[PDB]
Design an enzyme around this catalytic site. Structure first.
Site, mmCIF file in Angstrom:
data_model
loop_
_atom_site.group_PDB
_atom_site.id
_atom_site.type_symbol
_atom_site.label_atom_id
_atom_site.label_comp_id
_atom_site.label_asym_id
_atom_site.label_seq_id
_atom_site.Cartn_x
_atom_site.Cartn_y
_atom_site.Cartn_z
ATOM 1 N NE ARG A 109 -2.446 -1.805 3.422
ATOM 2 C CZ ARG A 109 -2.781 -1.661 4.685
ATOM 3 N NH1 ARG A 109 -3.537 -0.616 5.046
ATOM 4 N NH2 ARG A 109 -2.320 -2.541 5.589
ATOM 5 C CD1 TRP A 278 5.415 -4.955 -7.766
ATOM 6 C CD2 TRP A 278 4.339 -3.259 -8.778
ATOM 7 N NE1 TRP A 278 5.723 -3.799 -7.081
ATOM 8 C CE2 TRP A 278 5.084 -2.741 -7.678
ATOM 9 C CE3 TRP A 278 3.593 -2.372 -9.575
ATOM 10 C CZ2 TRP A 278 5.100 -1.365 -7.354
ATOM 11 C CZ3 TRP A 278 3.604 -1.006 -9.253
ATOM 12 C CH2 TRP A 278 4.355 -0.519 -8.157
ATOM 13 C CD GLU A 283 1.598 -11.635 -4.162
ATOM 14 O OE1 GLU A 283 0.355 -11.590 -4.263
ATOM 15 O OE2 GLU A 283 2.324 -10.668 -4.572
HETATM 16 C C1 HEM Z 1 1.598 -2.610 -6.474
HETATM 17 C C2 HEM Z 1 2.033 -3.734 -5.927
HETATM 18 C C3 HEM Z 1 1.267 -4.590 -4.907
HETATM 19 C C4 HEM Z 1 1.883 -5.466 -4.110
HETATM 20 C C5 HEM Z 1 3.419 -5.730 -4.069
HETATM 21 C C6 HEM Z 1 0.850 -6.111 -3.313
HETATM 22 C C7 HEM Z 1 1.037 -7.068 -2.344
HETATM 23 C C8 HEM Z 1 0.036 -7.864 -1.811
HETATM 24 C C9 HEM Z 1 0.175 -9.166 -1.179
HETATM 25 C C10 HEM Z 1 1.508 -9.944 -1.035
HETATM 26 C C11 HEM Z 1 -1.046 -9.564 -0.762
HETATM 27 C C12 HEM Z 1 -1.451 -10.878 -0.073
HETATM 28 C C13 HEM Z 1 -1.721 -11.772 -1.284
HETATM 29 C C14 HEM Z 1 -1.810 -13.233 -0.978
HETATM 30 O O1 HEM Z 1 -0.936 -13.733 -0.234
HETATM 31 O O2 HEM Z 1 -2.751 -13.885 -1.535
HETATM 32 C C15 HEM Z 1 -1.982 -8.542 -1.118
HETATM 33 C C16 HEM Z 1 -3.312 -8.583 -0.836
HETATM 34 C C17 HEM Z 1 -4.247 -7.623 -1.195
HETATM 35 N N1 HEM Z 1 -4.022 -6.426 -1.860
HETATM 36 FE FE1 HEM Z 1 -2.177 -5.866 -2.645
HETATM 37 N N2 HEM Z 1 -0.373 -5.520 -3.614
HETATM 38 C C18 HEM Z 1 -0.165 -4.633 -4.649
HETATM 39 C C19 HEM Z 1 -1.176 -3.920 -5.275
HETATM 40 C C20 HEM Z 1 -2.520 -3.908 -4.896
HETATM 41 C C21 HEM Z 1 -3.545 -3.086 -5.515
HETATM 42 C C22 HEM Z 1 -3.341 -2.232 -6.793
HETATM 43 C C23 HEM Z 1 -4.679 -3.282 -4.825
HETATM 44 C C24 HEM Z 1 -6.067 -2.649 -5.084
HETATM 45 C C25 HEM Z 1 -6.162 -1.533 -5.804
HETATM 46 C C26 HEM Z 1 -4.409 -4.180 -3.722
HETATM 47 C C27 HEM Z 1 -5.318 -4.599 -2.754
HETATM 48 C C28 HEM Z 1 -5.234 -5.789 -2.075
HETATM 49 C C29 HEM Z 1 -6.309 -6.518 -1.439
HETATM 50 C C30 HEM Z 1 -7.823 -6.134 -1.310
HETATM 51 C C31 HEM Z 1 -5.637 -7.747 -0.861
HETATM 52 C C32 HEM Z 1 -6.293 -8.919 -0.068
HETATM 53 C C33 HEM Z 1 -6.828 -9.896 -1.137
HETATM 54 C C34 HEM Z 1 -7.697 -10.939 -0.499
HETATM 55 O O3 HEM Z 1 -8.255 -10.705 0.608
HETATM 56 O O4 HEM Z 1 -7.801 -12.005 -1.110
HETATM 57 N N3 HEM Z 1 -3.093 -4.510 -3.769
HETATM 58 N N4 HEM Z 1 -1.275 -7.472 -1.663
HETATM 59 C C1 LIG Z 2 -11.165 -17.698 0.971
HETATM 60 C C2 LIG Z 2 -10.377 -16.466 0.531
HETATM 61 C C3 LIG Z 2 -10.537 -15.208 1.136
HETATM 62 C C4 LIG Z 2 -9.793 -14.090 0.696
HETATM 63 N N1 LIG Z 2 -9.967 -12.866 1.313
HETATM 64 N N2 LIG Z 2 -8.917 -14.274 -0.345
HETATM 65 C C5 LIG Z 2 -8.736 -15.498 -0.935
HETATM 66 C C6 LIG Z 2 -7.763 -15.724 -2.068
HETATM 67 C C7 LIG Z 2 -6.524 -16.539 -1.644
HETATM 68 C C8 LIG Z 2 -5.807 -15.992 -0.402
HETATM 69 N N3 LIG Z 2 -4.361 -16.030 -0.704
HETATM 70 C C9 LIG Z 2 -4.084 -16.509 -2.043
HETATM 71 C C10 LIG Z 2 -5.462 -16.426 -2.729
HETATM 72 O O1 LIG Z 2 -5.727 -15.123 -3.270
HETATM 73 C C11 LIG Z 2 -4.889 -14.708 -4.342
HETATM 74 C C12 LIG Z 2 -5.130 -13.207 -4.376
HETATM 75 C C13 LIG Z 2 -4.286 -12.571 -5.450
HETATM 76 C C14 LIG Z 2 -3.074 -11.952 -4.810
HETATM 77 C C15 LIG Z 2 -3.376 -10.606 -4.177
HETATM 78 C C16 LIG Z 2 -2.557 -9.558 -4.904
HETATM 79 C C17 LIG Z 2 -3.229 -8.471 -5.471
HETATM 80 C C18 LIG Z 2 -2.525 -7.504 -6.154
HETATM 81 C C19 LIG Z 2 -1.137 -7.610 -6.224
HETATM 82 C C20 LIG Z 2 -0.487 -8.685 -5.642
HETATM 83 N N4 LIG Z 2 0.849 -8.768 -5.720
HETATM 84 N N5 LIG Z 2 -1.192 -9.675 -5.012
HETATM 85 C C21 LIG Z 2 -9.459 -16.604 -0.508
#
Ligand code: HEM
Ligand SMILES: Cc1cc(N)nc(C[C@@H]2CNC[C@@H]2OCCCCCc2cccc(N)n2)c1
Ligand code: HEM
Ligand SMILES: Cc1cc(N)nc(C[C@@H]2CNC[C@@H]2OCCCCCc2cccc(N)n2)c1
Ligand SMILES: C[C@H](O)[C@H](O)[C@H]1CNc2nc(N)[nH]c(=O)c2N1
Ligand SMILES: C[C@H](O)[C@H](O)[C@H]1CNc2nc(N)[nH]c(=O)c2N1
Ligand SMILES: [Zn+2]
Lengths: 407, 411
Positions: A109, A278, A283
């Protein structure tokens, strides 16, 4: 009503006040912590609208001005009349940037204010959605120099006319149950792959097949579209020292792009809002490759390194995990595709936390998601206390649409 | 009410009813989660209820609930409280109590072992010298020449909170830290403050990188006294690596016996402010935290230098690389010396089995995810993917403030 967070490595103490402005519920009580659970009308809408516009007008330093009291009145009359309202472009951009700013599970963020917002509220068909999404993929990919973006389809109306992207991310690989009993490609997507095939898709039945987008406009049955291959930037994975690595035949995509979430702005719900940034290296290399339920490659890599797999205590899993992640990083960097490592990303997040504490009074953060899935304690986020709370605008998880939609 | 927890790797879903017996506070609310916050004199009025809960639990565990023996014990404790303001636990209750505090410790991944705990009853102790003897016997019993045995020693309970027994060391065995005038630290940075108190109390510091600290012991609210644990009793392991022969020349060693001494044990409303307990190490406590925290021995750079890793940017994962080699070394060294140690793979796997058993037989297992997941290789261990419910059961272990901030000096 004034809360401290301590970093145990540096002793820095920060004071949180932003939590008082928090609105939704966490899942926890005084009696039970749910910190590690993955998923814990007209009258309703005006407070939600008001709360939002108040923060918006405050951000542009015009709180309590005529332009403020005029918009508040306009929105109020529109809700009274239509049972909903429309956001100004300026409000939409603000809401979107702030939903990311408020995403407590996001380590990335520091980047929140650099978000290209694509207003697709004028969209009406699945073909339209496909056009918008291809344009988003190409803009964001930018030949490997990745740029954050979101594309926002029309808001929920009566709830029977939702726009939804049925894919969980814009770009993912298919998974197929085999006669063998095992799994070909990505086990996470078996179900979705079947839904595509049961809706017409011609699967190549390979290990790394880019799934078709499955798009739902205006609550209609969803339709299939293949993303132009020239738009899906992929990366063959090699190691800077291990010759044999390439022969595993591993690749991953450059664009992480989440498309199953719901964007809530001033009470309005945007159920189709794919967004992308990105990758952090882990991940892909820790989760995508190594999870037992994912590509699960540790065993095969450990063998090629000729490690002692006889006993867990030789740390063969750990040793191979590191090399797999070195290779992910090295491959992206060599092919010039933006990637960040977990050291740099977590160091950035600490900087961002401190900015958000002095500038905003806090920063909601979910420690359980923020600390990387490898090497937790040698990243600074491990030792940083965090407070987790829910602010709006926000991104929310929503149920898989096949579980809901009537055909 | 029922709460469900899912494991996202296996799809196994568990149902927790035990959380209904929970009483104390988490620190969280419906508005804020403090799940990653490290820290989120009793009347008669409060006391008999706490005693009653406890004895109801104990009597149930022995299948004697509602027995004459249960009712007679309730009456007896009631009377002892009404007449003396406190009460004394029977041996059987103390033992059961100390077992269940460990069983209830939601931050402990080692709990599969909760029922095999040697309890040393030290409630007859009266002096620091008495405390010293008790602690020596504990260290020698627990060490057992490398075949480590879990144990706990329980000194007299709090009375008026003016007469507390306390072990001032945070663990029975730990290394001295010394701040140098140039700002560097010699030995272990975590222990600088406590080392300084020891020095001021008259400890003659050897000033080395691995000096075992003396015990500083408080009996009956008196000023603390210094004692040197006999060195023949302090088992130590020199750290070397199976393939890297230069590893030995870094000069590292560690002690075999992890022994927490600064926590407070609550059983039936009574407070045991000195209750040192010990088990055996999971390798990452030493290899990840003790050696590789920047605020501790911080050896990552020196290791990676010797390994000739590319150290110019983080994305070579040089830190991750060095960290694994060090952890390999710690497990190799302990195993080669026949000192009990568990790796983080085997420990987390045992924990998941323990946890499932506890849901079936106890109706739950409170667990703090932030602490249960190891500080390296998190997601390749099965606890990462395990949803957990954290709540507070008694009997319990609690953090207490360091006694040097509260102690009333007598002179
Ligand atoms: C620009 C580089 C970004 C990086 C390096 C990054 C990094 C990450 C990582 C490592 C996670 C956890 C993902 C996982 O383990 O599944 C995550 C989750 C998340 N990010 Fe980011 N992010 C980026 C951009 C964004 C953007 C552009 C948005 C929205 C505009 C965003 C919103 C979110 C949300 C809502 C989650 C939680 C997803 C879920 O609950 O499944 N991120 N981010
Ligand atoms: C059950 C559930 C709840 C919840 N809030 N999210 C998920 C999705 C699962 C949680 N961790 C891996 C999988 O989600 C993949 C989400 C995509 C990665 C998020 C992300 C977004 C933008 C950039 C970035 N580098 N990474 C699953
Ligand atoms: C038998 C081998 C044991 C193992 C392998 C084990 C494992 C661990 C580990 C890895 C931690 C986290 C500590 C840290 O990272 O700093 C811990 C915490 C803890 N364990 Fe154990 N444990 C064992 C035995 C015991 C015993 C015998 C007791 C008491 C009877 C106990 C009670 C606790 C408590 C109270 C904590 C939290 C300490 C704190 O908050 O500072 N454990 N355990
Ligand atoms: C502030 C604070 C609160 C709290 N509850 N505990 C602490 C002590 C911190 C927590 N982690 C590092 C430091 O203490 C060392 C923990 C002791 C080891 C626990 C243990 C006991 C028995 C066996 C074993 N392998 N491990 C500090
Ligand atoms: C059970 C636990 O909540 C679950 O495994 C979480 C843990 N932390 C995570 N952290 C990230 N960044 N992504 C995840 O998918 C998860 N999964
Ligand atoms: C801020 C955070 O809660 C703190 O650094 C915790 C995280 N998890 C931990 N887990 C264990 N086992 N031991 C610890 O000392 C810590 N420290
Ligand atoms: Zn909580």
């Amino acid at each position: 009503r004034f809360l401290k967070v301590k970093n145990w490595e540096t002793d820095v103490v920060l004071t949180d006040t932003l939590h008082l402005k928090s609105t939704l519920e966490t899942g926890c009580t005084e009696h039970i912590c749910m910190g590690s659970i993955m998923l814990p009308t007209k009258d309703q809408l005006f407070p939600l609208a008001k709360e939002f516009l108040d923060q918006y007008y405050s951000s542009i330093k015009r709180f309590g001005s005529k332009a403020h009291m005029d918009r508040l009145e306009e929105v109020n009359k529109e809700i009274e009349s239509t049972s909903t309202y429309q956001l100004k472009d300026t409000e939409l951009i603000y809401g979107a940037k702030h939903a990311w700013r408020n995403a407590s599970r996001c380590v990335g963020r520091i980047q929140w204010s650099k978000l290209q917002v694509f207003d697709a509220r004028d969209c009406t068909t699945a073909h339209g959605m496909f056009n918008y999404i291809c344009n988003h993929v190409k803009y964001a990919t930018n030949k490997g120099n990745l740029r954050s973006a979101i594309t926002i389809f029309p808001q929920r109306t009566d709830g029977k006319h939702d726009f939804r992207v049925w894919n969980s991310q814009l770009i993912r690989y298919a998974g197929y149950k085999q006669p063998d009993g095992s799994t070909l490609g990505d086990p996470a997507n078996v179900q979705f792959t079947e839904i595509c095939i049961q809706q017409g898709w011609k699967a190549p039945r390979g290990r790394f097949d880019v799934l078709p987008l499955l798009l739902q406009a205006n609550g209609n049955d969803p339709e299939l579209f293949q993303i132009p291959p020239e738009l899906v930037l992929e990366v063959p994975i090699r190691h800077p020292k291990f010759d044999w690595f390439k022969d595993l035949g591993l690749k991953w995509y450059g664009l992480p792009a989440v498309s199953n979430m719901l964007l809530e702005i001033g009470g309005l719900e945007f159920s189709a809002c794919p967004f992308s940034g990105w990758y952090m290296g882990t991940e892909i290399g820790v989760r995508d490759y190594c999870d037992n339920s994912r590509y699960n490659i540790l065993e095969e890599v450990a063998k090629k390194m000729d490690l002692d797999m006889r006993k867990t205590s030789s740390l063969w899993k750990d040793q191979a995990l590191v090399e797999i992640n070195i290779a992910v990083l090295y491959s992206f960097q060599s092919d010039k595709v933006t990637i960040v490592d977990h050291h740099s990303a977590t160091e950035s997040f600490i900087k961002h936390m401190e900015n958000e504490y002095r500038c905003r009074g806090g920063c909601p953060a979910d420690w359980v998601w923020i600390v990387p899935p490898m090497s937790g304690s040698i990243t600074p986020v491990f030792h940083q206390e965090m407070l987790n709370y829910r602010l709006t605008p926000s991104f929310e998880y929503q149920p898989d649409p096949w579980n809901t939609h009537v055909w």
